[PDB]
Specification:
Chain lengths: 362, 362
């Protein structure tokens, strides 16, 4: 008899892991009512209430951000986080607005997922401070009346006078047992032409460089609307310079350290949103794209009648996450199956394992 | 009885195409002896003797380059070219050497394959010239005694005096029937610190920019070994500027125009090399990576005892290309199969279609 895939994430061997927020964090005081996964699976997730891998990339604890040192290893990976940076947050640093932050978010998650498919371990690490320097200020946001906290990573600095300056930073090749064969590192900038301070409109730009790497940004057009934009870079371990065009410089203070596995396996991501009385975004659906990521979308709103509150304990995702309880043979966008000859519907890519073939063909 | 995959490329529907060189070019005077594909399949390939998609990206006809206006459409794609730019060519423009060109080649093919998996049609097009400008020279190579021809795409220019200048170029949204929903466009530069001309060491750099795009390069370090390096960019149709830091500017003159299909299908690439008495490279194997490309490597040298000459008519690839004669149900790194329940060996990803499962599991 042909088998019907269980819509939702799955795993074909015990070497699998998850990344999450409150909805997979057994440390939460409302556990198990606040969970969207089975409680027996919490030990498989690296998760913290209030956090997301995007938040933790850019911010330390404070000014409204709950940061977490995410760290896990698995050939197979399930991501269920992202919601803790949605338009609901009402954050802007310059004039990019909420949608500017949805764009940064898509950028981050797109790079994370594609890199994670080539990796087994993923670990947020702190970088050593750069070679010392002088006569500078840290950057601030003008957004939200100056209350918006600019990222701690990368760290922007502004020199007291126009200067020539290159400072050195290091991406390590390991972190307490994990090999960092590559790093996900942010590079952010403020576009919109020259940047006005105390009556002088300065060229804005800087770059990362080494003998085998370059990435930079520069503008000196007429001043217009300014936007804080981030690029997410894959960088090898080693020594780099951050270099100024005169007034501005950034250096990274954190990275996601990843190792490399030789067989690429698509990651899985589940739609991470709020209930309908808050502004969510579709950043996860935009970032989780074939062929590197298998997206399990919600077809209903986030509804938690048996949960801790209206934003924690969704029935649909709960049902989806029942899939992680079985030892499957096949993982696909249609969901998971045990070993079987025939499927009740066509299984498409991206998939992996041993997948049943659509019965009507035979 | 379990089926054995035919090692080599394949197709599951008639909507498939190929891209090639002499070894799939029925216009060649030694046809069919010079072919590595069956002759009945020539009408499925966009191919020219002496060319490659990498050559055609950068050069017009002449100075030793045979350029071709590659153009084809297929949900499924087989690439069999690349060899016509190997270290055998002995080309350098600055001091990057042959390996510098292997690196550019990997860059190009990596971007081409990944983009092509999201596209159906791929077409080399000529761009309109940029908005006019004055008091300039075209760049030249110092390599090979000044005999090395610098790419026609992108076109480097050097201004008579330090200047401020932004010029406009256009990536069109169509090309005679094909929708150009995206473009593969090169951006190349010369690294190694400031660039010495007539006693003055100039900062080297420039950028492409629009309100929704930036990509740039800049150096002003002490002069060292200079290398001509290329980045291969995915760009939306529309209007852009090329902008100088003072002395140098590039603008693109060609792109690969691609449309978009909504279901991503991995492309297939076959190892394109010379016989053992010439220097080949493994750029295709480095660029054709899971999950966007299925690489069929040669396990033997290029040997053509029944071919037109020692570089045309390989037995191994000939056998591989027999796969394209059948209407298969499954395409994989193990090769192609018709519809079947069971396989004699495990089928791995990337694959697509309906694939038999490994018999020993049942
Ligand atoms: C943030 O603070 C909490 C305690 O409130 C702690 O559990 C967590 O580890 C802190 N985050 C980081 C990144 O150190
Ligand atoms: C953000 O603004 C929206 C729209 O005004 C508001 O409804 C929402 O509660 C605000 N978010 C926070 C965290 O206060
Ligand atoms: C800038 O930020 C760093 C990292 O947050 C901090 O330790 C340092 O004290 C700040 N420097 C200045 C000059 O405010
Ligand atoms: C940047 O732009 C300003 C204002 O147009 C101009 O006067 C200045 O020369 C520019 N600076 C550089 C380094 O190009
Ligand atoms: C996911 O689902 C919602 C509505 O159910 C839809 O609006 C959104 O576009 C979907 N996104 C993707 C990428 O499927
Ligand atoms: C190069 O020249 C040949 C004739 O020798 C011609 O077939 C080919 O189309 C030319 N290439 C281009 C790109 O026009
Ligand atoms: C390139 O140089 C190699 C090594 O010296 C030589 O054997 C080969 O024939 C040269 N290539 C060409 C096209 O002449
Ligand atoms: C530079 O190259 C273009 C394109 O090849 C050519 O048409 C033009 O005549 C050249 N300009 C100069 C000043 O040599
Ligand atoms: C570039 O470097 C030279 C030589 O070190 C220096 O004198 C010059 O001021 C620099 N130019 C700019 C625009 O920074
Ligand atoms: C392909 O084959 C050759 C030798 O048969 C080997 O040296 C090369 O590394 C191979 N490359 C890949 C990526 O498999």
């Amino acid at each position: 008899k042909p088998i019907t895939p269980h819509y939702g994430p799955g795993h074909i061997t015990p070497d699998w892991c998850g990344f999450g927020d409150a909805r997979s964090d057994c440390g939460n005081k409302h556990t198990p009512k606040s969970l969207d996964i089975p409680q027996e699976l919490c030990p498989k997730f690296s998760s913290r209430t209030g956090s997301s891998m995007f938040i933790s990339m850019h911010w330390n604890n404070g000014s409204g951000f709950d940061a977490f040192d995410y760290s896990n290893c698995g050939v197979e990976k399930v991501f269920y986080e992202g919601v803790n940076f949605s338009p609901h947050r009402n954050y802007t640093c310059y004039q990019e607005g909420s949608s500017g932050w949805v764009s940064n978010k898509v950028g981050f998650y797109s790079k994370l997922y594609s890199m994670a498919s080539t990796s087994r371990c993923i670990k947020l690490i702190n970088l050593d401070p750069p070679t010392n320097f002088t006569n500078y200020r840290n950057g601030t946001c003008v957004g939200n009346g100056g209350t918006a906290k600019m990222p701690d990573n990368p760290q922007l600095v502004i020199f007291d006078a126009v200067t020539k300056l290159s400072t050195q930073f290091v991406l390590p090749n390991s972190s307490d047992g994990v090999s960092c064969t590559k790093h996900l590192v942010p590079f952010c900038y403020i576009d919109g032409g020259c940047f006005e301070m105390s009556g002088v409109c300065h060229p804005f730009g800087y770059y990362y460089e080494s003998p085998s790497f370059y990435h930079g940004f520069y503008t000196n057009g007429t001043a217009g609307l300014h936007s804080y934009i981030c690029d997410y870079l894959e960088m090898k371990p080693g020594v780099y310079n951050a270099t100024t065009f005169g007034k501005f410089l950034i250096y990274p203070t954190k990275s996601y350290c990843m190792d490399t596995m030789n067989y690429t396996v698509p990651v899985q991501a589940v739609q991470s949103i709020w209930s309908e009385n808050r502004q969510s975004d579709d950043a996860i659906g935009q970032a989780c794209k074939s062929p590197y990521c298998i997206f399990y979308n919600k077809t209903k709103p986030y509804l938690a009648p048996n949960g801790a509150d209206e934003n924690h304990g969704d029935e649909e995702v709960r049902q989806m996450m029942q899939g992680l309880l079985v030892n499957s043979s096949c993982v696909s966008p249609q969901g998971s199956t045990p070993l079987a000859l025939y499927s009740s519907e066509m299984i498409y890519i991206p998939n992996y394992g041993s997948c049943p073939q659509y019965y009507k063909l035979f």
